[PDB]
């Protein structure tokens with residue numbers, strides 16, 4: 221082994237022996253603020269809390285209710301042919317990281333498209349705090365103070381509050397965010413696959429030309445490459461593995477990853493700590509809200525940047 | 533120019549330098565809540581000094597005379613060196629050794645007598661190993677350890693050691709690190725710490741030195757005796773640099789270190805987080821007590837083990 225390979229081996233053997241990030245802790249009761257800070261926030265350690273929330277949104281938010289309550293408002297929706305907004309797709313021999321087609325439409329039309337299992341895949345996943353900016357009325361059916369047990373660790377209000385409503389075919393491919401994430405399913409369920417950041421060396425990442433989905437004259441989807449004004453492809457680094465069906469022959473390093481699986485039901489809270497890898501699937505027409513808080517930087521981020529350099 | 537390992541260490545250090553990780557000892561004027569301590573200091577591996585935090589009876593009462601009277605002029609373990617560097621590097625006959633102190637037992641009144649001799653050998657009650665709870669139990673009555681609950685609730689375990697320190701100004705503790713969270717309480721005088729964060733390991737030169745112990749001859753003159761396993765000469769890894777006057781020509785990598793200086797007065801508390809390098813000096817006949825808690829292994833330990841592998 222190289223000296224870098226020897227060092228990465230040491231990291232992984234130590235983390236394995238000490239069970240770092242080796243499970244998703246399951247709680248049936250909301251912990252105290254101190255508990256959360258000590259056992260989950262400070263260890264960068266995920267946790268799922270079952271039936272933690274009894275917000276009126278839970279049990280009342282349906283497509284019909286939302287159409288009524290919002291007056292069939294026009295909302296931002298992402299559309300893909302293949303179900304992978306912000307995900308890899310191939311065209312004419314080339315693999316692209318592809319951004320969704322984004323458009324505006326009335327909620328009733330979104331619901332109609334969600335009821336077509338062979339049509340294009342629709343997903344209200346704009347995030348960018350779309351709930352507080354675009355759907356503020358929904359806030360009245362939530363109680364954010366119920367998240368104080370976690371927010372005390374972040375010691376600031378959410379930097380974003382997001383609303384998600386999607387087709388079962390809409391899959392969020394694996395990525396990491398520079399946020400603490402408190403994830404609250406409202407209706408249906410979400411299936412998460414999670415990988416700890418210290419396993420970066422087991423997760424293959426490529427550099428892909430970036431494209432965006434567009435529709436042709438005939439309504440057919442294609443990928444429009446993004447180029448800069450110099451004619452160069454705009455590149456995006458992206459996780460290359462499919463956690464649902466990994467090709468261990470192409471990516472043997474992934475064999476050493478220990479992906480964690482967790483289903484999150486209505487009323488459950490998942491704490492997804494900063495820089496954790498996650499891939500997300502959903503039940504059909506699943507509804508969820510989530511709260512992003514900017515991370516607080518310490519040495520772990522610098523070690524992560526070192527890990528990136530070592531695997532480059 | 534640079535190896536792969538050296539490029540990776542450079543990225544680590546550049547990211548830590550831009551974020552100023554561990555760039556200052558935090559100054560508080562009052563004891564934080566447990567949640568605050570866990571969020572701002574424990575979880576960040578971040579040193580903090582709390583000014584005039586403690587009013588323990590000891591701070592008023594512990595003089596040499598009171599200590600003699602209270603311990604019945606007990607015979608105590610005391611460490612003696614000629615140069616003031618117990619557990620520190622010294623040269624003899626052209627060879628550089630890491631030297632352990634001459635350890636002996638003598639009555640406290642005699643120790644104090646020898647502290648008052650500015651030209652005599654350097655004495656230091658530095659046994660650690662929880663010498664206060666073990667060898668000087670009565671002194672506990674002048675303490676209020678409950679006042680440290682703000683920190684202990686974050687370590688969520690009782691102290692693993694309680695140590696008592698009383699030293700000559702000449703007695704200096706050379707730079708080292710400990711696998712313990714350290715809550716350090718100055719009772720009389722002041723301590724001067726030089727602190728270096730663990731992610732700067734590659735900036736701190738470390739060597740392998742033959743191990744020796746101080747002894748005195750029939751004539752009273754000090755010398756170093758090599759230590760041998762009951763076998764070969766024994767060796768120890770030790771920090772090579774003198775942070776008070778570093779030889780940057782011999783150790784240019786130390787120029788990239790960013791040491792912190794903090795003075796801890798009577799009544800003050802210093803949180804010295806696990807694995808931080810520290811060098812410690814004291815006012816004359818300084819008295820201190822500290823508490824060690826075994827560390828909880830997290831990802832930072834795994835990263836640090838990897839860093840040790842890369843720095844060898």
Ligand SMILES: O=C(O)CNC(=O)C(=O)O
Nearest residue numbers: 384392397401403500510
């Ligand atoms: O809900 C999804 O499909 C994906 N969500 C996220 O990546 C997130 O909350 O960070």
Ligand SMILES: O=C(O)CNC(=O)C(=O)O
Nearest residue numbers: 697705710714716812822
């Ligand atoms: O006080 C001293 O001289 C040295 N103390 C320590 O190294 C410590 O408390 O861990």
Ligand SMILES: [Mn+2]
Nearest residue numbers: 395396397498
């Ligand atoms: Mn995400």
Ligand SMILES: [Mn+2]
Nearest residue numbers: 708709710810
């Ligand atoms: Mn120490």
